[PDB]
Amino acid sequence: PLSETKCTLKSFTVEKGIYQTSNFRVQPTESIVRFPNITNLCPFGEVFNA
Amino acid sequence: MYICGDSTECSNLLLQYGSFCTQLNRALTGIAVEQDKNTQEVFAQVKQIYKTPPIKDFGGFNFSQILPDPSKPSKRSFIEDLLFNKVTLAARDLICAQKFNGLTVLPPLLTDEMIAQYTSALLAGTITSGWTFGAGAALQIPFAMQMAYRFNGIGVTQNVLYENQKLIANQFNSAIGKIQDSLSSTASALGKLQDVVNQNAQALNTLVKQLSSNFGAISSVLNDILARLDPPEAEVQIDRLITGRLQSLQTYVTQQLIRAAEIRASANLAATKMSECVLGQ
Amino acid sequence: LSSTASALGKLQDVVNQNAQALNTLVKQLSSNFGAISSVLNDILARLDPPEAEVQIDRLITGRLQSLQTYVTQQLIRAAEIRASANLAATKMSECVLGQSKRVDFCGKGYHLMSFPQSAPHGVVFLHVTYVPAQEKNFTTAPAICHDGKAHFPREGVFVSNGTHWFVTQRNFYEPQIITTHNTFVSGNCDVVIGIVNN
Amino acid sequence: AYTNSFTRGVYYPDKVFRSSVLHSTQDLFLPFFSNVTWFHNPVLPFNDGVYFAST
Amino acid sequence: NIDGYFKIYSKHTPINPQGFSALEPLVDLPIGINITRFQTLLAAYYVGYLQPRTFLLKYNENGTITDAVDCALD
Amino acid sequence: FNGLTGTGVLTESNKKFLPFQQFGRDIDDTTDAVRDPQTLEILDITPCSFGGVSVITPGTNTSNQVAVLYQGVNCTEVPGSNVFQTRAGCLIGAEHVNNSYECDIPIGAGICASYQSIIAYTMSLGAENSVAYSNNSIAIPINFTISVTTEILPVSMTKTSVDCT
Ligand SMILES: *[C@@H]1O[C@H](CO)[C@@H](O[C@@H]2O[C@H](CO)[C@@H](O)[C@H](O)[C@H]2NC(C)=O)[C@H](O)[C@H]1NC(C)=O
Ligand SMILES: *[C@@H]1O[C@H](CO)[C@@H](O[C@@H]2O[C@H](CO)[C@@H](O)[C@H](O)[C@H]2NC(C)=O)[C@H](O)[C@H]1NC(C)=O
Ligand SMILES: *[C@@H]1O[C@H](CO)[C@@H](O[C@@H]2O[C@H](CO)[C@@H](O)[C@H](O)[C@H]2NC(C)=O)[C@H](O)[C@H]1NC(C)=O
Ligand SMILES: *[C@@H]1O[C@H](CO)[C@@H](O[C@@H]2O[C@H](CO)[C@@H](O)[C@H](O)[C@H]2NC(C)=O)[C@H](O)[C@H]1NC(C)=O
Ligand SMILES: *[C@@H]1O[C@H](CO)[C@@H](O[C@@H]2O[C@H](CO)[C@@H](O)[C@H](O)[C@H]2NC(C)=O)[C@H](O)[C@H]1NC(C)=O
Ligand SMILES: *[C@@H]1O[C@H](CO)[C@@H](O[C@@H]2O[C@H](CO)[C@@H](O)[C@H](O)[C@H]2NC(C)=O)[C@H](O)[C@H]1NC(C)=O
Ligand SMILES: *[C@@H]1O[C@H](CO)[C@@H](O[C@@H]2O[C@H](CO)[C@@H](O)[C@H](O)[C@H]2NC(C)=O)[C@H](O)[C@H]1NC(C)=O
Ligand SMILES: *[C@@H]1O[C@H](CO)[C@@H](O[C@@H]2O[C@H](CO)[C@@H](O)[C@H](O)[C@H]2NC(C)=O)[C@H](O)[C@H]1NC(C)=O
Ligand SMILES: *[C@@H]1O[C@H](CO)[C@@H](O[C@@H]2O[C@H](CO)[C@@H](O)[C@H](O)[C@H]2NC(C)=O)[C@H](O)[C@H]1NC(C)=O
Ligand SMILES: *[C@@H]1O[C@H](CO)[C@@H](O[C@@H]2O[C@H](CO)[C@@H](O)[C@H](O)[C@H]2NC(C)=O)[C@H](O)[C@H]1NC(C)=O
Ligand SMILES: *[C@@H]1O[C@H](CO)[C@@H](O)[C@H](O)[C@H]1NC(C)=O
Ligand SMILES: *[C@@H]1O[C@H](CO)[C@@H](O)[C@H](O)[C@H]1NC(C)=O
Ligand SMILES: *[C@@H]1O[C@H](CO)[C@@H](O)[C@H](O)[C@H]1NC(C)=O
Ligand SMILES: *[C@@H]1O[C@H](CO)[C@@H](O)[C@H](O)[C@H]1NC(C)=O
Ligand SMILES: *[C@@H]1O[C@H](CO)[C@@H](O)[C@H](O)[C@H]1NC(C)=O
Numbered sequence: 144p145l146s147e148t149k150c151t152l153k154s155f156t157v158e159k160g161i162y163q164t165s166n167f168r169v170q171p172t173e174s175i176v177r178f179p180n181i182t183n184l185c186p187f188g189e190v191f192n193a
Numbered sequence: 194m195y196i197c198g199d200s201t202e203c204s205n206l207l208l209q210y211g212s213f214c215t216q217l218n219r220a221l222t223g224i225a226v227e228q229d230k231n232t233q234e235v236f237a238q239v240k241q242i243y244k245t246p247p248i249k250d251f252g253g254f255n256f257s258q259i260l261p262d263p264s265k266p267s268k269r270s271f272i273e274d275l276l277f278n279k280v281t282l283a284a285r286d287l288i289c290a291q292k293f294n295g296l297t298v299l300p301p302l303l304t305d306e307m308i309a310q311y312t313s314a315l316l317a318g319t320i321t322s323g324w325t326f327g328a329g330a331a332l333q334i335p336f337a338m339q340m341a342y343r344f345n346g347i348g349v350t351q352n353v354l355y356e357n358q359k360l361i362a363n364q365f366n367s368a369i370g371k372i373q374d375s376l377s378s379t380a381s382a383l384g385k386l387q388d389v390v391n392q393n394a395q396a397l398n399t400l401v402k403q404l405s406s407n408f409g410a411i412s413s414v415l416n417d418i419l420a421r422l423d424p425p426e427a428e429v430q431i432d433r434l435i436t437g438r439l440q441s442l443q444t445y446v447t448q449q450l451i452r453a454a455e456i457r458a459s460a461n462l463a464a465t466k467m468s469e470c471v472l473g474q
Numbered sequence: 475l476s477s478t479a480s481a482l483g484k485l486q487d488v489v490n491q492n493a494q495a496l497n498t499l500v501k502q503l504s505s506n507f508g509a510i511s512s513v514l515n516d517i518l519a520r521l522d523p524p525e526a527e528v529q530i531d532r533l534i535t536g537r538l539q540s541l542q543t544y545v546t547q548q549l550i551r552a553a554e555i556r557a558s559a560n561l562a563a564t565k566m567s568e569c570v571l572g573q574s575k576r577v578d579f580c581g582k583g584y585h586l587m588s589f590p591q592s593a594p595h596g597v598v599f600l601h602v603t604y605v606p607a608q609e610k611n612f613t614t615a616p617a618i619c620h621d622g623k624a625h626f627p628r629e630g631v632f633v634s635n636g637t638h639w640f641v642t643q644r645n646f647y648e649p650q651i652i653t654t655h656n657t658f659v660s661g662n663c664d665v666v667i668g669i670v671n672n
Numbered sequence: 673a674y675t676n677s678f679t680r681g682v683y684y685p686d687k688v689f690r691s692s693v694l695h696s697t698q699d700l701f702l703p704f705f706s707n708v709t710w711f712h713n714p715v716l717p718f719n720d721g722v723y724f725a726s727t
Numbered sequence: 728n729i730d731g732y733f734k735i736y737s738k739h740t741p742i743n744p745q746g747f748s749a750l751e752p753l754v755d756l757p758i759g760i761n762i763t764r765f766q767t768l769l770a771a772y773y774v775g776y777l778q779p780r781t782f783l784l785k786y787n788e789n790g791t792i793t794d795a796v797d798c799a800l801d
Numbered sequence: 802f803n804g805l806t807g808t809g810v811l812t813e814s815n816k817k818f819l820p821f822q823q824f825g826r827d828i829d830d831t832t833d834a835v836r837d838p839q840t841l842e843i844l845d846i847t848p849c850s851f852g853g854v855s856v857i858t859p860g861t862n863t864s865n866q867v868a869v870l871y872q873g874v875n876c877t878e879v880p881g882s883n884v885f886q887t888r889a890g891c892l893i894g895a896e897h898v899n900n901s902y903e904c905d906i907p908i909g910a911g912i913c914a915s916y917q918s919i920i921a922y923t924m925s926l927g928a929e930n931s932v933a934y935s936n937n938s939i940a941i942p943i944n945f946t947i948s949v950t951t952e953i954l955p956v957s958m959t960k961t962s963v964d965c966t
C-alpha cells in the first residue's frame with residue numbers, strides 16, 4: 144500500500160498521517176435464478192397417444 | 194458507483210470526461226476535516242480534567258441538576274438527558290450505514306462521552322476556581338467570595354450579597370427548577386438543530402430520488418438499455434444518462450459547500466461565546 | 475521560528491489550494507469529451523462542416539462546464555478569505571491600538587501589548603501577556619467584626635498567614651496592615667455568615 | 673336516490689408490499705364525496721372502469 | 728380494463744355505507760377487447776364511475792391500507 | 802427471482818406479507834424483501850459491502866511500515882498481521898494496547914493510532930487532577946512571568962484573470 148500512497152500524492156516522501164487510497168467491492172460469486180413450480184404443462188400426447 | 198453502477202462499458206464511456214471524481218472527493222474530504230476542526234476548537238478549551246469535590250457546600254446554591262451523576266451509564270447530567278431525548282429525528286445498530294447507491298456516513302471523531310467529559314471539566318473548573326483557570330493554573334476560592342467579586346463588576350457594592358445570600362440562593366434554585374420544567378414539558382424549543390438535520394436529510398433524499406429519471410433516453414436503468422439495443426448505437430443514451438447524473442452530483446456538492454460555510458460561521462460564534470462568557474465575565 | 479518548520483501552515487495551505495485549482499483547470503484541455511480528438515485544429519481541417527459543427531459543439535459545451543465550475547469555486551474561497559481579513563482588521567484595531575479587556579481574544583493570559591509584522595500574503599501578531607505562578611494557601615474571611623460593626627475591603631481580599639490578618643490584592647501577594655482607610659463599614663455583624671473577630 | 677359515496681373505493685393499486693410509510697399515487701379512482709346513481713335492465717356504459725356495490 | 732388486461736378487484740362480503748376498507752385484487756385476465764357497456768343478470772345495486780386522480784395512502788405496520796386522502800378536494 | 806434481477810445477500814427474514822403480495826419495498830423504491838416462488842418464504846436482501854480503504858503511515862523518514870484501515874466493513878470477509886475490529890471499520894497491521902496516551906493520527910470513534918510498531922489505542926483527554934476546594938481557603942500567586950506568542954492570519958490571495966475566447 145505504501146506505493147499506492149506514493150502514487151496518489153505524487154511524491155517520493157509522504158508525511159505522517161492518514162491518506163485515502165481507493166475503494167473495494169466484494170464481487171458476487173454465484174448466480175441464482177428461481178421460477179415457480181412447473182404445472183399444467185401443455186397437452187402433447189392427446190394428438191400422439193390417441 | 195453512483196453514476197455507472199458496476200458496468201464496464203459505462204466506465205469506459207465515463208473515463209474520458211476528465212477527472213471530475215477527483216475534485217468531488219477532494220471537496221467532500223475538505224468539508225469533513227473542517228467539521229472535525231469545528232468541534233475540536235469549540236470544546237477543547239482546557240488542558241486538564243478537573244473533578245468536582247466529593248462534598249458539596251457551595252454556599253447554599255444547589256447544582257445537583259447540572260453536575261453529572263454515577264447511576265447513569267453515560268455519565269451525563271439531567272439537563273443533558275432531557276435535551277438528548279427531545280431530538281427524536283448508536284448501540285450496536287452500526288456498521289450498517291451504507292445505502293444501495295454508493296454513499297456513506299462517517300462517524301464523528303469525538304464520541305459523545307468525551308464531549309460529556311469536556312463539559313464536566315469546564316463546569317467543575319468554573320464552579321471551584323472562577324475565571325483564573327483560563328489564564329494560568331486553577332486557584333481555588335470559596336463560592337460566596339467569587340459571587341461577591343462577580344457583583345462588584347457590574348457596579349453593585351458587595352455589601353448587597355452577604356446580607357442577601359439566602360434570597361439569592363433561593364431565587365437561583367427556583368429559576369433552575371423552572372427552566373428544567375419548561376424544557377421538559379414545552380416542545381419545539383430546539384429549532385435550530387432540528388432544522389439543520391431536516392435540511393441535510395432532505396437534500397440526500399432528493400439526490401437519491403433524482404437517480405430514476407429518463408433524462409431523454411429510452412429508460413432509466415442502464416442494464417435494460419444496454420441489453421436491448423446494439424453497442425454501435427446504444428451509446429448515445431448512455432451518454433445522456435452520464436451527463437444528467439454528473440449535473441445532479443455537481444448541484445448537490447455546491448449546495449453542501451454553501452451550507453458548510455454557514456455552519457462554520459455559527460461554530461466560530463459559539464467558540465467566541467464559550468470563551469468570553471464562561472471563562473470570564 | 476528559524477529552526478522549526480510548519481508554523482506558517484495557513485499561508486502555505488492557501489497557496490497550495492490555489493495552485494491545485496489552477497492546475498486542474500489547465501489539465502482539462504486534453505479531454506476528449508465525446509468528440510473524436512482533443513485538439514481542434516486537426517478535427518476542423520479533416521472533416522466536412524456538417525460533422526465538424528457537432529464535434530466542436532460537444533467540445534465547447536465541455537469547456538464551458540469546466541470554466542463555470544472553476545469560477546464558482548473561486549467565489550467560495552474568496553468569501554472565506556474576506557471573513558478572515560475582517561477578523562484580522564478587527565484584531566489590529568483593538569489589540570494593537572489599545573488594550574483589550576475581553577478574554578482569550580489576544581493570547582492566553584492578561585493582555586499587555588502587541589506588535590504586528592508582515593508576511594507574504596498575511597500578517598503576524600506578537601502578543602505579550604502576563605501569567606502568574608508560585609501560589610500558596612492562606613485562610614480567608616469575608617468581613618471583620620470590630621466594635622460590633624462589619625468592615626469589608628474596598629479593593630482586595632482578607633487573608634491570614636497563621637497569626638495576623640492582612641488585605642492583599644487578588645493578582646499578587648503584597649500584604650498590608652488593616653486600617654480604616656482601606657476598609658469600609660456597613661451595618662452590624664449578626665447576619666454575615668463567615669465573620670471573624672479582630 | 674343519489675346517495676353519497678363517503679369514502680368508498682380505495683383499492684390496492686399493485687402487489688408491492690410496503691410498511692409504515694405514506695405513498696402518493698396517480699391512478700383511476702372513484703373520487704371522495706361523489707354521487708352514485710342508485711338503480712333497481714339498462715345496458716349501462718363502461719367508459720374506463722366501474723365500481724359496483726350491492727346489498 | 729387496461730391495455731389488454733381485465734382486472735377484477737373485490738371486497739367480497741363486508742358485514743355491516745360509511746367507513747373505511749380497502750379492496751384486494753382477485754383476478755387478472757389477459758385478453759383485450761374494445762369494451763363499452765355491460766349488463767347484469769337477475770336486487771338494487773349502487774353504481775359509480777372511476778376517473779384519474781391523485782391520492783395519498785397511509786400504509787399500516789402490516790402492509791394494510793388504513794387511511795387515504797384525496798388531493799384535489801379542498 | 803421471477804423476472805427482477807439484482808445483486809445482494811439473501812437472509813432469512815420475519816416479515817408479514819399479504820397473500821397477494823409478491824415482493825416488498827423500502828422508502829426509496831429499493832427492493833428489501835422477496836418471497837421465493839417455491840416454498841412461499843420471505844428472504845431479506847442486503848447489498849454487498851463496499852467502503853474506501855485508507856493507509857496510516859508514520860512518515861517515510863522514520864520507517865516503511867503502514868497499517869491499512871478498511872472503513873465500515875465487518876472485518877470477517879476482508880480478504881496478514883493482527884486484525885483489530887473497531888467501530889469505524891477494521892485495522893490490519895496495527896497492534897492493540899491497554900493504555901491511553903494523547904494521540905496524533907486520529908482514525909475515528911475515539912480510536913487513534915500512533916508509532917511506538919504502530920499501536921492503536923483510545924484517547925486520553927488530559928491528566929485528571931482535583932483542586933482541594935474548601936470554603937475558607939484561597940490561593941494567591943507570589944510571582945509572575947511574561948510570555949510572547951504568535952498569530953498568523955491571511956488577508957489576501959492571488960489575483961487572476963482568464964479570457965473565455
Ligand atoms: C412445488 O413442488 C414441490 C415439490 O413437488 C413442493 O414441495 C413439497 O410440498 C409439500 C406440500 O404439500 C410438502 O409436504 C413436501 O414436503 C414438499 N417437498 C419438497 C421436496 O419440498 C412445493 O410445495 C410446491 N409448491 C407450490 C407452490 O406448488
Ligand atoms: C438540589 O435539588 C435536587 C433536585 O430536586 C434535590 O433532590 C431532591 O431531594 C429530595 C430529598 O432527597 C427528593 O425528595 C427529591 O425527589 C429530589 N429531587 C429530584 C428531582 O429527584 C436536592 O435535595 C437539592 N439539594 C438539597 C441540598 O436539598
Ligand atoms: C424583594 O423581592 C423578593 C422576591 O422578589 C421579596 O422576597 C419575598 O418576600 C415575601 C414576603 O416577605 C416572602 O413571602 C417570599 O418568600 C420572599 N421571596 C423569597 C425568594 O425569599 C422581598 O420581600 C422583596 N423586598 C422588598 C423590600 O420589596
Ligand atoms: C505572619 O506575618 C507576621 C508579620 O510579618 C509575622 O509577625 C512577625 O514575625 C517576625 C518573624 O517571622 C517577627 O520578627 C516579628 O516580630 C513579628 N511581628 C509581630 C508584630 O509580632 C508572623 O510571624 C507571621 N506568621 C508566621 C506563622 O510566621
Ligand atoms: C465553612 O466550613 C464548613 C464547611 O462544611 C462549615 O463549618 C461548620 O460549621 C458548623 C457550625 O458553625 C460546625 O459545627 C462545623 O464543625 C463546621 N465544620 C467545619 C469543617 O469547620 C461551614 O459551611 C463553614 N464555616 C464557617 C465558619 O465559615
Ligand atoms: C466575637 O466577639 C463577640 C463580642 O464579645 C462575641 O459575642 C459574644 O459571644 C458570647 C458567646 O456566644 C456571648 O455569651 C456574648 O453575649 C456575646 N457578646 C459579647 C459582647 O460578649 C463572639 O462570640 C465572638 N466570636 C468569636 C468567633 O470569637
Ligand atoms: C400486525 O401483525 C402482527 C403479527 O401478525 C400482530 O402482532 C401480534 O399479532 C397476534 C395475532 O393474534 C396478537 O395476538 C398479538 O397480540 C400481536 N402483538 C402485538 C405486539 O401487536 C400485530 O398486532 C398486527 N398489527 C395490526 C393488525 O395492526
Ligand atoms: C460481524 O458479523 C458477525 C456475524 O453476524 C457478528 O457476530 C454476531 O453478531 C450478532 C449481533 O449482530 C450476535 O447476536 C451474534 O452472537 C454474533 N456471533 C455469531 C452470529 O456467531 C459480529 O458482531 C459483527 N461485527 C460487528 C457488528 O462489529
Ligand atoms: C494547599 O493545601 C492543600 C491541602 O492541604 C494542598 O492540597 C493537597 O496537597 C498535598 C501535598 O502533599 C497533596 O498530597 C494532596 O493531594 C493535595 N490535595 C488534593 C485534593 O489534591 C495544596 O497542595 C496546598 N497548596 C500548595 C500550593 O501547596
Ligand atoms: C520570580 O521568578 C524569577 C524567575 O522566573 C526569579 O528571578 C530569578 O531568581 C533566581 C534566583 O536568584 C536567579 O538565579 C535568576 O537569575 C532570576 N531570574 C531573573 C530573570 O532575574 C525571582 O526571584 C522570583 N521571585 C521570587 C520572589 O522568588
Ligand atoms: C405417448 O406415450 C409414450 C409411452 O407409451 C410416451 O413415451 C410418449 O412420450 C407419449 N407421447 C407424447 C407425445 O408424449
Ligand atoms: C349529487 O347530486 C345532487 C343533485 O343531482 C346534488 O345536489 C349534490 O350536490 C350531488 N352531490 C355531490 C357530492 O356533489
Ligand atoms: C379496438 O379496436 C381498434 C380498431 O378499431 C384497435 O386498434 C384496438 O387495438 C382495439 N382495442 C381493444 C382494447 O380491443
Ligand atoms: C524524519 O524527519 C522527522 C521530521 O520531524 C523527524 O522527526 C524524524 O526523526 C526523522 N527521521 C529520522 C530517522 O531521522
Ligand atoms: C486488556 O486487559 C484485559 C483485562 O485485563 C485483557 O483481557 C486483554 O487481553 C488486554 N488487552 C491487551 C491488548 O493486552
